[model samples]
Target chain A: MYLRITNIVESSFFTKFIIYLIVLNGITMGLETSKTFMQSFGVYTTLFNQIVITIFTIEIILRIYVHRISFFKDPWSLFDFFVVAISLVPTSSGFEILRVLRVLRLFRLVTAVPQMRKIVSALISVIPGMLSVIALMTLFFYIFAIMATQLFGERFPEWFGTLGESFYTLFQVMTLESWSMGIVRPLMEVYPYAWVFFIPFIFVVTFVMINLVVAICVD
Target chain B: MYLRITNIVESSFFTKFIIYLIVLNGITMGLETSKTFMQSFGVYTTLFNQIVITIFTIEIILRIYVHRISFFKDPWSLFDFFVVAISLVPTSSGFEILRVLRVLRLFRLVTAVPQMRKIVSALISVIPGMLSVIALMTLFFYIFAIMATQLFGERFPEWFGTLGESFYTLFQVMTLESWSMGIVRPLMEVYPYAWVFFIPFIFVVTFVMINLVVAICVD
Candidate 1:
């Protein structure tokens, strides 16, 4: 029975559809939190939300029916069932907080698809290499951030706002370009000699990120 | 002679060493760009930059010596030689402006190794599917930007800023989290009901980005 439930969850299109539905719900929740525009159509939002909850309830019921007496044997299935039940509770009663669990539904996409499973497996295979690269990047970030704070903390107070800000700026240099201005510009202004730093940074961002790391992953 | 040159470049250890050198150069560049203290050492920067250029020059000399007559025979080989020669000019002229062409050095890394060649082949094989995904993403970005501009341009002047800003905000929402504040917050404040957009956006990000797109890239 446990094996059967696992098989269904692992292979079914119904599971994929459910994941899509949950993602839709989560996005709506985020939008609801930020936008008051949905308030005017309270009836519409409530009705749609209830419809989704009802479908989830029916899905739980169907899964229970399929598994019969052994449904509780698999913990995740029962956990999912209870989660749907709890989310059905009203917002005024404060039980609506469980709606955040909708994000978990995104995981179902992985559970349902073989392709995603393979990609994840590939990424997992490269974990050691990726971790090493990440560690090196982190070390560089701290070393650079500390240097930036010492040299340009006074001139570009906004750019080197704090150690945290400096770290954020370093993160940008590693992943993107805009952050370079904050970290590099002030240093360049104060000391014309500082332009030397640009060489290695450009090399790492362009060569390492695009050539080595990406090449290793793709290979 | 051309065949001999290709064979030497395809050899394992030499190729591996070149890749390592390129990777090391990248890491050093990344570090230099982010570190203020490192920038203070002008002599060190100039030395390291000169070393990389020197290494690159040696690489070109070896390739040209081996290929000899074929250097001008193949268009790609000729193109490669042109880019390398142009890159060298910046080092001599002391004009950093044309140094942007130095990025072409990355292409050398590609030609230096057979493994990288194999990876490129695989990527080319998957180009059709990847192109479709990129096209879809571009379309979504364009549509979302236009909608944000028309709907919330006046209310979220600071956030949307302009059509370009609106496009940028959408790009962030799709690729970065800043969109949540820049786009979502303003829309919610004015139109509250427009949370519908969040549904598809999140679905694409979590499900499509993680599952569909990545899955297609994996073996």
Candidate 2:
């Protein structure tokens, strides 16, 4: 029976159409959030939102019917079912929760396409190494931010006013900009020799950071 | 005789070391312009630079001594001869010419190391496709910037002050932040009802841009 259902879902045009609809709906929802089209409809926005939820609910039901008892056993399938059900609960209490849950529907597109699946898998595999590099970069930035704040806080009040602002400046450095004139030049006005420190910091962040990020990935 | 010289140069550690030193010296001079220092002593820098050049000169002389009349036939061998001879030019003219030559030496390192060579080759293979994507992205950005400036230029004077500022904000949207807050928020403050225009632009740039970049690299 399981094999029979699996075979039908795999080959059926209706099943493919339904899957594609769900994927498109998820994309539209993401678009709706980022763009204002859905909200501009004003009176129809809530109606459209509910209609989307209904379609999502039907998708969950079909998936459950196909998988039967084994449906809940698969975590992703269970997640999909729960998100759909939770989103249908037309109440303000969990509206934000539902909005967050809808974001996961974007992940459903991965199951609809094989190429995306491979790319996603490759990306997932690289996550650990990428995260490690990110962590190291974050650490380096934090340390530099602290040093900059300590050394030039009084001189560059706007840039090094607090640890947070120092971090913001560090973040700008990663993008390789002439941020020094914006942030450090004013500081130099007060502390004439601040350029000596600022210039080297820019060089290290640009050159050393690139090499470090590349080395980490290569390793 | 040419084969003997090529073989000796290929096998000799001292010969390779000499070439490496000349390349390093060239890089050091260029980097000095930016005031980045790997070493401090002026005399030591000059001494080391000379030693490296001398070793390179001797290796080139040995190549000519072995290759005899046919030495200039091999393009790469000729290139090697030129690089070494150029490195030997007196300090006054040598320094400025060497700065530009250093850029070429950077490519030599890519050829010299197998792993680096593979990376360079992969980067070269991807260059055309990457450039195409970059061109497309630039075109998209320009269109969006022009539209934003035309529509919201007066309202959001801070962000949409000019085409350049719009491009800057669009660039920030591309890499770091969600377009909703980073981009649309400020725009909305100026043109609250303009979510109609802003939202779809955000959706296309964020989702479509991401999928397009991924699709280009993926199979």
Candidate 3:
């Protein structure tokens, strides 16, 4: 009996069915967002959702039973288990919101979809280099923030009055978010040499960011 | 006489003097932006600008005399010639704006500074790939914009009323400039499955952008 159950659990047909069910559930969830559709098919959506949750719950239990302890060892399986678990849980008044938890089910696509799995794995491997770049970025940001606070702090208090403010303002500048007409050009009206300071800061940070992206792509 | 002029033009001292003069002129131009500084040292700034311009004019003439037609062959030389020529021309009340043209002198640093030259050359080589990616990007933007206008045009007229407006709003979304709070969340309230459309659009555009940066960096 145990051998037969394991055979059913590991079947390719079962796997494909689960993938299709997950995609159908995702589409239905998307459709529920439409008021007109919900007015007509709201009952059906709820019914369909209950069915998907039940099937997912059963599928998870079978895998856990068949794999036993090794089921917990696989991180993707663990993630799938939690995503399904979230959907299965009842919504209570006390610190529980299951409506949003439904969204977690969509993320299971990362595990089930081969392409998404490959992309996620690639991203995971590139993270260490990204961390180092981020660390270097912090030092550069800190130095520039301090300089901006000192030079323009008194004049442009709103932008550079404090270290935190300077950091925020500098971040906006780095993003080129209205940097010219909104911030720098006005600052230049008082300190024309401001570009001497800001332009170099822009160059250093953007250069670092570009290289970080390049490192990820190469990986 | 021609040989003597070529020798002087090629001398390290002359080259260093030109670089220093360019820096000085750039600084003075910056200082001129300050009304207070202009009030106090405006005459001196004017005198200094004239002197620097005179030196630049003389330097260009010497280079042309020494290098002959080859002076025009070198793009950097042609750029320098044009920059200096723009400065030499009188600012008439016509199709001329010399005040802004003075800023062109600042760009001469691109030719003078070896590092800036290297960066400019690298960026130049990356342009063909950038153009192709830009072309691909335009098609994606057009398709998304058309879809947005067709689907959400009646409901969110301000954001998706026309193709152009949708294109602009989509651009704001791509930049993530208050995309959630300013646009998408409000959009979601009306069209709950809005993420189903917008999230994929965001992912596609940002992925392309990251790859473009990666291509430039790898180059």
Candidate 4:
């Protein structure tokens, strides 16, 4: 029996089986979003969800048993541990917890698939060089944030009220979300020349500098 | 006189002078936003704006005259042509046209500075790889848009009423804007497992696939 279980775990067929289950699990999770559908088949989907969770739990245990101490040492194993373990725990507190728990398995692809593993590591590998860019970003953000506070604090108390507020708002602006339309244009209506602060702020903080940081990293 | 203008346009000092004037023009355009400030110096700023526009036109013409057809053939020269041309013409059409035209000069650095020109080229180089990722993204988005329409259409008609609306809302979510606060949280009140859709939507679209695209392109 032990030999049979080990053989099953080691087989490519078993790997595909787990992948199939994950896709099924992803679908089931997505289906649970519809209240009308859930009202009709909630219990059935719950049973399906619980079965998938139990299977995931068993698979991880078998993985740990097969790999032994080496399994715990692997970071990928730890992620898989968290993914499976989170699913099995009683999550009665609220939907927020459930929402977070349901998504953990989405990241399991990083460990289960070889291509995904390479992709994960590629993102990690760029972090070292990206730190230099991030550092430059921090320094410039400080300069811009202080300027924002000094300029807009009096008028836009809620947004630029403090250094922290300015930092948050400026970061939001950098992301270009409803910025000119929602925020800058409104402020310009009052200060008029406020565009001087905001426009160059985009040139310096948003496009030129940040893109420069990502430029070398991109290629 | 002909020799003087050609030499001025060709020399490095002339390039620096144009860069200086662009910065000045940027500041004056910004100052035009402030009614009070514009009231005080409106005449002077308008005059300054006209003078700078003339200088830019002269400089571009001189460069074109020097480089002849070669100037128009160069893409950066074409950018200069557009920039000067936009400034020469009228944006008195409407706020929308003015909004688009106002930001065009921010890109003046691409044609004005050597390092920035190189940086712009690097971003352009990444476009080939970016397209493959973008195509994959479009497929996923189409899938999600349909799913969102099916799941949330009856409830949040404005955001998810149809395929196109779902696409627009999901695109906004991709930008990490007021997604959680604006769309997801309110939807969650009724559909407790609403996150079943949105969370994975974010993971798949915003985090995993998008970052993967950036990762490969970065290298």
Candidate 5:
């Protein structure tokens, strides 16, 4: 009995069917967002969603039965299980936010497609290499945030009063959103030498970020 | 006489003196921005500016005399000539905006320092590799901007009324600064399916940008 079910679960046809169902589920999720489609086919759409969920639940059960404890061992399996589990959450009035998370189910496409799976796994592999750079960047942020708070906190309470405010403001500056005309220039009027502090901060932070990108891709 | 001047221009002592002057001129430019500094050292600062410009002019004249026709052929030489020439531009009240341009003289450090020159040249070398990707991105921007203007122009005139507005708004969205709450979420209320348009646009453009970065680093 065990051997028979394992053969059924591991079959190529079963794999392809699951992939198709995932894609179909993705299409329906989009359609569910459309008021016109809901008004016209709301009943049928709800039924189709229930039917898709049934099939997905069966698929997960079959895999778990075949792999047993090994199913939880594979990270990809865990990823697939987690995605399905999120959708199964009862989206009652209080849990309605889970409706937006139907979008995450589409990420199962990453697991279903071999190329995408490989690409994602390869990208994740770069994380280990990035830890040191990330630590350096966090340190840079902390030191600068404290410095900014001390320097400008009194004058510009809103932007630099607290460490958190300084961190966020520094992040905004890093993005170059309106750092010059918006934040730095106004600060400059009061602190004529502020650029001496801010300019190096921008350069060092930018240099580190660029190096971070290079390290990720190169790794 | 020509040989003697050429020898002097190439001499270690003369090169070091020019480098020091460039660094000193950079300091004075910053000091010039200070109201307190101006009150204290305004006269001496004025004298120091003339003295630095005099030495820079003499240095350029010596290099031109030494290198002659070949001077213009070397791009770095032209860059050096341009930086020095801008400072001599007579910042009269009418041309006071030129005062802000004393900043450019600091860039002469790139030409003065061999390591910085190499780093800049290397960065410029990546430009040729980027042109095709940039062209493709520009094409993407044009198509999407036109599409956005047509779709939302009547309703969201402030954002997508014209090609230029659409382009700027799309650029802001790309930066992800208040993109959803500020623009897209508001647009979503009217055009409920607007995410269908913008989501793919974001993904494709971001993919292209990341690939562009990867290509630069890989190349």
Candidate 6:
């Protein structure tokens, strides 16, 4: 019986079926987000969601039964187990955050797809290098945010109202979205030398971010 | 003598001086952006600008005199030449675009700084691999844009009015800024099944982009 359960859990057909079911569950999850669909087919959407959760629960219990103590050994298996466990959280309880986590169910697609699995594993590998650059970027953002708040906070209360807002606006500038004509140009009318502070900040941060990308890509 | 001019271009002191001049010119460029700045210090700004341009012209001419045909062979040297050439373009003429070309003068800093030059070359080196992933992304974007236009364009004309607008909104979504509570949640009100389309779209594109970053980083 143990052998049979293990075979079922490890079978290629079984894996494909679960993948398809997850995809179906994904569709059902999406349907619940639409008001019109839920208004007309509310009963059906709940039924489908309940069915997917039930199937996922069974999928986990059987895998646990087959793999036994070894089920906890595989991280991917743990990932599957955890994702399923979250969906099982009772909504009647105070833990409403878990309700928002229905979207995490989609992450299972990463483990289900081979390419995604490889990419995620590799992504974790670059984390150490990534942290150092992030730390540096954060430090620069802090320093510049302080400067911006002091320099332009009084005049442009909306954008540089607080340190927090400064960072947000700086982040917007860093993304190259509306840095030039949107923020800086308007400020130039007042400070006259505003670009000395902002343009260089933009230049340095951009240069450093580019540096970080090169460091990561070359690693 | 011609030898003296050659020495001026090749000398380390001359290079450092020119580097300082570029930094000075950068400040002047920033000041020019403000009307008040020009009104108060307009004469000084113009004089400084003229001095930098004349110096740059002399530097380029002397470098050309020394290096002759060999000057164009070195790309950095050629870059300096082209930038100086652009700055020398008469601003009084009908070519108003060259007024903007004044900003390109700051790029001389890239050639001047050892670290900046190294970062730039590495940035270029990583481009080919970056493009293949970008191309794949663009293809996916087109397909999704068409889907978004077809499905939501009729209802949410403001957000998904046309193919171009969908692509723009989708690009914003891909960047993870205001994607969740900003776009998706607001969207769920009308297109309850929207997440069915959007969540998967976000998941796939995010997975692919992460894949590209990892692939490039690993290489």
Q: Score the docking of each candidate (DockQ).
A: 0.03, 0.02, 0.05, 0.06, 0.05, 0.05
How is the predicted docking of candidate 1 categorized under the CAPRI scheme? incorrect
Candidate 6 residue runs with Cα over 4 Å from true position: A65-74, A92-97, B1-157, B160-168, B173-219
Candidate 2: give the clashing pairs: A35-B199
Q: Looking at candidate 3, what is the lDDT of residue A89?
A: 77
Q: Regarding TM-score, does 2 or 6 come out ahead?
A: 6
lDDT of 2 by residue, A1-219 (tens): 766655655566755775776655654543343234545755455565677677767766766777788888975577667666766665567434444444445455555555544544544454465566568767878898898888876766656767866775565545434455555576777788877876777776677556644443454
User: Candidate 5 clashing pairs?
Assistant: none
Alpha carbon lDDT at A143, candidate 2? 91
Task: List the candidates' TM-scores in order.
Answer: 0.43, 0.45, 0.50, 0.54, 0.54, 0.53
lDDT of 4 by residue, A1-219 (tens): 677787888889878888888767766655565556679988898898889888888899888777889999998999989778877667665444544455557556446667556645754565575566668888988998998899888989867879976876786577566678767998897789989887887877656544644554464
| Chain B alone vs. reference chain B, TM-score for every model | 0.60, 0.57, 0.77, 0.80, 0.89, 0.81
Q: Can you write out model 3's per-residue Cα lDDT over B1-219, one digit (the tens) per residue?
A: 888888999999988888898777766765565546779998999898888889889999998889889989998889998988888887565543454555667667667767555545644555687788889998999999999999899999877999987876787677666677767889998899998998899899999988887677676
Off-target runs (Cα >4 Å) in candidate 5 are A1-172, A176-212, A215-219, B93-95, B153-158
lDDT of candidates 1 onward, in order: 0.60, 0.60, 0.79, 0.74, 0.79, 0.78
Which numbered prediction scores highest in DockQ against the true structure? 4
Residue A8 error for model 5, in Å? 65
Superposition error at A145 for model 4 (Å): 3.5
Error of 6 at B50 (Å): 61
Candidate 4 residue spans exceeding 4 A from truth = A1-5, A146-151, A162-165, A207-219, B1-157, B160-168, B175-219
Which has the higher lDDT value, candidate number 1 or candidate number 5?
5
Identify the runs in model 1 with alpha carbons over 4 angstroms from their true place. Answer: A1-219, B1-41, B44-48, B51-55, B61-86, B89-125, B176-178, B204-211, B214-219
For every model shown, the clashing-pair count is 14, 1, 0, 6, 0, 4
